[PDB]
């Protein structure tokens, strides 16, 4: 499906339907400040096409939303290319949220998780975040219903050791947390435990095929997951390969070429040669 740009949804649900035909959000997704929404507004609402967000996901003050299991059932990767103060996932002051329910979330490349001040929030102790983030050291999961000890969490599920005890791994009463053998690393596996291709990230429709990945570990090009963009293509938004012409079209209303990447701006020590979008180093101090 489509690549949609970063979104910022506030006040009304109307604008949320802009996500309807979408596979990747190239940017962040913020859903916030919905004070008059009620559970009935979310009973019939789903975006099953969404597989990946390149930056971060932020949910703040969205009233009436009880679970995300119907909203983002297939969200598999949050890349964390840009973060919200070190976080790739932010659940803050989500009054009414009873569970996360992101049962397809396999990997958070880059950042950490901040789930704070969610009265009603359970199904947190049941999640093994070490399967999703390399660093759980910087997670900040506090002041939720889960803190009190009396979340009647009820889950078959692959219990793992977090403290000194094995604890069940599930997202909701009807969804276990997927765990792949350690040998699969982050590539994901099939229901039968067979590793996905090494260029996949999190999940695949078939094993050992880089055109059958749910998401890419490295970069995406012409239906396929690739280790690097080959010439003449450029690395874009740290997830896809684009041609010069694409980067140029962006620039012309402000993107530049540097080290085989199409990037927002020239890095320090460089200025932009105008005729070919190319960052060239500075003869003496840089323009200012």
């Amino acid at each position, epitope marked *: 499906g489509e690549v949609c740009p970063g979104m910022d949804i506030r006040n009304n649900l109307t604008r949320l339907h802009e996500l309807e035909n979408c596979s990747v959000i190239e940017g962040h997704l913020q859903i916030l400040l919905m004070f008059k929404t009620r559970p009935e507004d979310f009973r019939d609402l789903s975006f099953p096409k969404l597989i990946m967000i390149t930056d971060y996901l932020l949910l703040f003050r969205v009233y009436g939303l009880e679970s995300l299991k119907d909203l983002f059932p297939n969200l598999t990767v949050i890349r964390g290319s840009r973060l919200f103060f070190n976080y790739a996932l932010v659940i803050f002051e989500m009054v009414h949220l009873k569970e996360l329910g992101l049962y397809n979330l396999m990997n958070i490349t880059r950042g950490s998780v901040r789930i704070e001040k969610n009265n009603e929030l359970c199904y947190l102790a049941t999640i093994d975040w070490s399967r999703i983030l390399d660093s759980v050291e910087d997670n900040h999961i506090v002041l939720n219903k889960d803190d009190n000890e009396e979340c009647g969490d009820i889950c078959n599920c692959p219990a793992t050791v977090i403290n000194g005890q094995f604890v069940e791994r599930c997202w909701t009463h009807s969804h276990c947390q997927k765990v792949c053998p350690t040998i699969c690393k982050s590539h994901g596996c099939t229901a039968e435990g067979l590793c996905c291709h090494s260029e996949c990230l999190g999940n695949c429709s078939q094993p050992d095929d880089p*055109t059958k990945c749910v998401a890419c570990r490295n970069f995406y090009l*012409d*239906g*396929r997951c690739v*280790e*690097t963009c080959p*010439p003449p293509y450029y690395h874009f938004q740290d997830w896809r*390969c684009v041609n010069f012409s694409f980067c140029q079209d962006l620039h012309h209303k402000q993107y530049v070429i540097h080290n*085989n990447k199409c990037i927002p701006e020239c890095p320090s020590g460089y200025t932009m040669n105008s005729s070919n979008l190319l960052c060239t180093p500075c003869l003496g101090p840089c323009p200012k």
Partner: antibody
Amino acid sequence: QVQLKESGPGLVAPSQSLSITCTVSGFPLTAYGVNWVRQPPGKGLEWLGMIWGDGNTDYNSALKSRLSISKDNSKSQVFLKMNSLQTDDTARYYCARDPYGSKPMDYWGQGTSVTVSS
Amino acid sequence: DIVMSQSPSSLVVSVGEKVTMSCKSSQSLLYSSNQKNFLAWYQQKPGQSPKLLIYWASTRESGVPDRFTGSGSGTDFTLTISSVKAEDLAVYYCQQYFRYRTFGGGTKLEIKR
């Protein structure tokens, strides 16, 4: 189950064109490139050109762009056409897959022998 | 257009010995964005189709004996066979896939007995 096979004419009269169809299976031409390489009897390999997933092509300038590479994604076929062959174009012609951003030419066809003579 | 040149054109070695052959490119094949060399080595046993052995100048293809080792960076490259076996007899080629794709002239390996 990656496979590639060339269907050539075997013989080409001097000044005539060479047409070869490479039929592939086990992968989609939309996600992989296909190259053509030739080997004169008892000599080395010469890279001729390739067709990327998007249909864009790269040709070896030594061929004096006598070469055309096209394809039909739905029929898993890649077409080589070369204008006005001469005796020195006598060689075994191979179509080889290349998984561009990840690997170099993985999976070669058995090749088809081409003789230019009357 | 990148030009590739290999040496020796040929050599002979007996079973068990180590062998090294070189490849040269008129332009650097070292990709900025990842610090990888866009060079490959192919082995062609006589009468057979060529086989990919090494890519990225040093990455060994799966199902390739540890005997084959690729070295070099930028414009100068080498292929090494760490204990030649009877069936290692073949022509070795290097290919650049940085800009377009071009093959070297190849090196022929014969076996002494």
